[PDB]
Amino acid sequence: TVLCQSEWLKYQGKCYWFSNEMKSWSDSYVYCLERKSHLLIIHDQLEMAFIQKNLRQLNYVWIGLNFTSLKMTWTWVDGSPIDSKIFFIKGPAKENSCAAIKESKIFSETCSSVFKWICQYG
C-alpha cells in the first residue's frame, strides 16, 4: 500500500523501470534523475535475481555504477564503493568506465556507448 509510478515494477518497497530505448550512461542517468529516481543500485543477491528475471541476456544494460578515479575504485551512484565479495566486474578500470549487466555478469564499458538502462527509487 505505497503505489509505484504507473508502468513501474515494485520489488521489496523499491520501484524499477526497465528501458526499451538505449542511450549513453550520462543520458540514461539524466533520464532517471528527471524522473526523481536513479540508475539501478543492486543492494544484494536477491535483488540481483529480480533484475535478471526482467532482462534479456544478449543486451548490455547500464546500471548506476562507474569508475570514480578519485578514490580510484568503482562506486555506486549512492557513493558507496562496491563490495569485491558480492560483485566482480569484468573489463578495464579506466576513467570513463561505467558498469553494464550482460549475460548475468557486470562489465566495464565506456560511458559513451548506448545501451538500455534501469531506473530505481524507494
48: enclosing H helix or E strand:
helix 45-53
CB of 52 to ligand NAG, least distance (A): 23
Say how many C-beta atoms besides its own lie within 10 A of residue 46's C-beta.
Answer: 10
> Which of these ranges, 13-21, 22-30, 42-50, 81-89, lies near ligand NAG under the rule CB under 6 A?
22-30
CB nearer to ligand NAG: give 95 or 103. Answer: 95
Site string for ligand NAG, 61-100 (x = CB under 6 A): -----x----------x------------------x-x--
CB-based burial label for 87 (10 Å; 0-12, 13-18, 19+)? middle
CB of 60 closer than 8 Å to CB of 22: no
Q: How far apart are CA 43 and CA 86, in angstroms?
A: 10
Question: According to the binding rule CB under 8 A, does residue 33 interact with its own copies?
Answer: yes
117: enclosing H helix or E strand:
strand 116-121
- Can you give the binding site for ligand NAG, defined by CB under 6 A? 25-26, 30, 34, 66, 77, 96, 98, 111
Binding-site ranges for its own copies (CB under 8 A) = 24, 26-27, 29-30, 33-34
